[PDB]
């Protein structure tokens, strides 16, 4: 179904690497 795709990442409230 509807998806952009990636083998990585998670929509956390913050980022400190990406
Ligand atoms: N269609 C959303 C799920 C797949 C992409 C986002 C998570 C990838 C680790």
From Swiss-Prot:
<feature type="lipid moiety-binding region" description="O-octanoyl serine; alternate">
    <location>
        <position position="3"/>
    </location>
</feature>
<protein>
    <recommendedName>
        <fullName>Ghrelin-27</fullName>
    </recommendedName>
</protein>
<feature type="lipid moiety-binding region" description="O-hexanoyl serine; alternate">
    <location>
        <position position="3"/>
    </location>
</feature>
<comment type="function">
    <text>Ghrelin is the ligand for growth hormone secretagogue receptor type 1 (GHSR). Induces the release of growth hormone from the pituitary. Has an appetite-stimulating effect, induces adiposity and stimulates gastric acid secretion. Involved in growth regulation.</text>
</comment>
<feature type="lipid moiety-binding region" description="O-decanoyl serine; alternate">
    <location>
        <position position="3"/>
    </location>
</feature>
<feature type="compositionally biased region" description="Basic and acidic residues">
    <location>
        <begin position="8"/>
        <end position="18"/>
    </location>
</feature>
């Amino acid at each position: 179904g509807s998806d952009f795709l990636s083998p990585e990442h998670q929509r956390v409230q913050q980022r400190k690497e990406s």
